[PDB]
Design a protein around this ligand. Structure first.
Ligand SMILES: CC[C@@]1(O)C[C@H](O[C@H]2C[C@H](N(C)C)[C@H](O)[C@H](C)O2)c2c(cc3c(c2O)C(=O)c2c(O)cccc2C3=O)[C@H]1C(=O)OC
Ligand SMILES: CC[C@@]1(O)C[C@H](O[C@H]2C[C@H](N(C)C)[C@H](O)[C@H](C)O2)c2c(cc3c(c2O)C(=O)c2c(O)cccc2C3=O)[C@H]1C(=O)OC
Ligand SMILES: Nc1ncnc2c1ncn2[C@@H]1O[C@H](CSCC[C@H](N)C(=O)O)[C@@H](O)[C@H]1O
Ligand SMILES: Nc1ncnc2c1ncn2[C@@H]1O[C@H](CSCC[C@H](N)C(=O)O)[C@@H](O)[C@H]1O
Lengths: 334, 340
């Protein structure tokens, strides 16, 4: 009977949907904003009081809410992470109208991705992942914000920027990694290569950090010739989005733009308790994009195809509000 | 710790990993000789690299273990996904069978919370039982999941009632007729009738025939919202009323009260809603929220049961008991109802 309870709990689809539904309704923020009754809570969220209580009941049973006084539910320690100002952003990561939780519906067709090795995102939303964001500015922004989370300081501190002149952050996102280098290395100029939409939140984030004279942004496709050369080329959580043959192409473009003596830095999670979140990231890449997490041995193959060699891998990098450690692989020409 | 706990709780990928393993019959294929991923992928027609990434999550959640290098075997928990296991959890997690198919309705849980209305129809085009009425594979699958393959999970509610003075039993919505069978084996003088829908009446007929009981239990096709096909002294409603919103349950109960013989009783076999700080609350809200998104139904408290009965001109005499069943993680009760 212990085994039965364990399997039912593990296989249950209603619990993560309860968490996600609570996040989308901003339930915890409404509690913290003074909604002390279910009546108040249903009004602020425009839901049915009878139905909202049945959701609160599961939220209590899984330890996200507690009933303090009768009919008064407040967040627990774990439940407070759904507050919108919490620096782990777990509410937005669970908001069904934001990009990742909406992407997560691709897991409902996991059998197909396991049969074919292809992502299931397109069969649900009409377009592959990044094409879908390209037509949905709310999701583009939303995804950009999730990706962005001060938090990339560990990778930057794991590399000596003494002899680095120009840094190119390929698929750099909102430019936080580039910013973390500029703060660390006062002599480097940096450039972010990013897609439409993103380049403007990158430009605004870089401006508001006071660094728009240290880091420019260029709109482009990193499968095409890169806009310029550099001594350090940054691929922070990019290649895991791509099958082997597309990652080779990206790496090849980086190699063609690498200055003499330069290095390509890959900031990712090497495939090896932590296994729970490793496999969650890895299967996400399967069903969203057709990508994957890769072992060190697999990394040697990809670099070899690109005419590169894995020079070194700098050990586990810990970050705030992040349950998975990171690595920095340094690549050189073959 | 807090961050890791919320992510585990909120993750969609773990239950879909379990459901994918059950749908591929992964555990059965290991149990049947597939010792390598290669042989596993071929038996399931899956990609070896992709099947391994799924296996890796099944190990992380403790459903498989790496015995020898590259050889994965089920754990004691993982063995519950074997097809002959009497709790039938593989079928319950099979995406092509009725309930795991219906669970997709949870992806629209907000709508159900906003409106109090089930979301099954918006995904599949038809209300739950109308969808089964067009899908013989699903109708059959659902009827087998309610039945359990165990002849004796109905014994506790059946042993909680004295069938001494009972002449005819009407099992309204009695599914495959196991509850009716459990009475006839405890009560040799009793005759029973199962009222069920098209398709199900035939699996109840063949189940009762193979139990040797077709001359003690008959089966009638019908709509329990219409006048019932005959009168009776015990009218059984086992796990039916939770499928229906209040107004429909009152209509069902009213039809039951109209068919009740003098001195007879309507028996309700369900889970009585009760506040709890216990581990069983997880499975209580699972059943209750399934009823919301599948059907618009609900689990009900005793207080709520009192109100339903009075609308139907009935009164709850006694609630007979949190009868605990062997190897079932949810408590059932038997409410005894008589006319007001
Ligand atoms: C929850 C852990 C992590 O935040 C690690 C990892 O997130 C880490 C690093 C990430 N990064 C910007 C440094 C950020 O600091 C975040 C708060 O923590 C991660 C995550 C998820 C994604 C991604 C992740 O990188 C993606 O990159 C990604 C992508 O590039 C394209 C589509 C989807 C995704 C992701 O879903 C997360 C993950 O591994 O979930 C299993
Ligand atoms: C796992 C516990 C239980 O089996 C209790 C409960 O199942 C109990 C009693 C049930 N019954 C036929 C006696 C059978 O013995 C089963 C193995 O155990 C239950 C369950 C599920 C359903 C239902 C359940 O009754 C339904 O009735 C149901 C329905 O009538 C129409 C659509 C869907 C469902 C259900 O999904 C289960 C439940 O509560 O899951 C949370
Ligand atoms: N063809 C393309 N050209 C340039 N950038 C691309 C691209 N396809 C995807 N990307 C970018 O790759 C990024 C990966 S996710 C964000 C990564 C960021 N460096 C970080 O570590 O936080 C996305 O921002 C996406 O816009
Ligand atoms: N209008 C209707 N008339 C008769 N039966 C109905 C019905 N609508 C739903 N049902 C039946 O109600 C049952 C609900 S589940 C049946 C549970 C079963 N008696 C048991 O305890 O094991 C299904 O078998 C379904 O066929």
């Amino acid at each position: 009977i212990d085994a039965l309870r364990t399997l039912i709990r593990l296989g249950s689809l209603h619990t993560p949907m309860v968490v996600r539904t609570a996040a989308t309704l901003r339930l915890v923020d409404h509690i913290l904003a003074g909604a002390r009754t279910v009546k108040a809570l249903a009004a602020r969220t425009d839901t049915r009081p009878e139905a909202l209580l049945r959701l609160i009941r599961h939220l209590v049973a899984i330890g996200l809410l507690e009933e303090d006084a009768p009919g008064e539910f407040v967040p627990t320690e774990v439940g407070e992470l759904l507050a919108d100002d919490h620096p782990a952003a777990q509410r937005a990561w669970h908001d069904l109208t934001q990009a990742v939780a909406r992407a997560d519906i691709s897991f409902t067709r996991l059998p197909d991705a396991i049969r074919t090795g292809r992502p299931t995102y397109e069969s649900i939303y009409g377009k592959p992942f990044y094409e879908d964001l390209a037509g949905r500015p709310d999701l583009r922004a939303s995804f950009d914000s999730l990706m962005a989370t001060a938090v990339d300081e560990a990778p930057a501190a794991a590399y000596d920027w003494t002899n680095v002149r120009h840094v190119l952050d390929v698929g750099g996102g909102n430019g936080g990694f580039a910013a973390a280098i500029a703060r660390r290395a006062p002599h480097v100029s940096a450039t972010v290569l990013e897609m439409a939409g993103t380049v403007d939140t990158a430009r605004s984030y870089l401006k508001d950090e006071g660094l728009s004279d240290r880091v420019d942004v260029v709109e482009g496709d990193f499968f095409e010739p890169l806009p310029r050369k550099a001594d350090a080329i940054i691929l922070s959580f990019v290649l895991l989005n791509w099958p082997d043959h597309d990652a080779v192409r990206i790496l090849t473009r980086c190699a063609e733009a690498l200055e003499p003596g330069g290095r390509i830095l890959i900031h990712e999670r090497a495939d090896v308790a932590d296994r729970f979140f490793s496999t969650l990231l890895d299967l996400r890449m399967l069903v969203f994009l057709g990508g994957a997490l890769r072992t060190r041995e697999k990394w040697d193959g990809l670099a070899a195809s690109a005419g590169l060699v894995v020079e070194e891998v700098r050990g586990p990098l810990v970050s705030p509000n992040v349950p998975l450690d990171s690595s920095l692989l340094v690549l050189a020409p073959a």
